[PDB]
């Protein structure tokens with residue numbers, strides 16, 4: 539559990555990344571994979587599961603490989619009926635069986651068991667997010683989930699998705715914010731955060747970024763606290 543908060547000279551600065559924040563934008567703007575009661579159909583490497591998940595929308599994929607931190611986590615979820623929710627990328631994505639193209643996408647984590655994970659009533663405790671702009675708490679909004687034990691990733695995607703649209707969190711060129719991290723605070727005081735900005739240099743490696751989600755970290759939707767901490771660029 540508990541991991542400190544960000545050190546100043548540690549956080550990523552958008553002015554140090556120089557290769558289309560749009561490429562970072564693609565991952566959170568109305569972009570994700572959602573599966574309702576799927577069981578692993580196959581596996582490429584020891585730590586991943588391949589689900590036969592079709593593109594409910596415009597069919598860009600029929601196979602989703604999601605990687606987990608290791609084989610012990612993969613063991614635990616293979617055989618299980620699961621609801622899936624993550625962010626995908628095609629870029630540097632896999633090579634399954636050699637025995638069967640149009641419809642191969644990748645993910646990290648995003649697995650939740652279907653049995654006992656939904657509320658008796660609708661989208662419950664639909665989680666509140668406190669946003670901080672230059673230390674000040676300026677806006678607060680609610681994202682909603684339907685699972686009692688949801689992945690940190692799901693709340694992250696929905697959080698950023700809102701931030702992109704109403705706060706222009708990410709532009710296609712660069713970003714109005716220099717730094718930013720999303721901090722999750724659990725009922726027990728467990729604290730853990732993710733950096734929202736890309737590593738320095740031109741290009742952005744999507745798979746290396748999303749990789750932080752492979753631990754398959756879940757939280758409780760009734761009790762989790764989320765605060766995102768941004769900072770503006772000067773002019």
Ligand SMILES: [Zn+2]
Nearest residue numbers: 574621652656
């Ligand atoms: Zn379900």
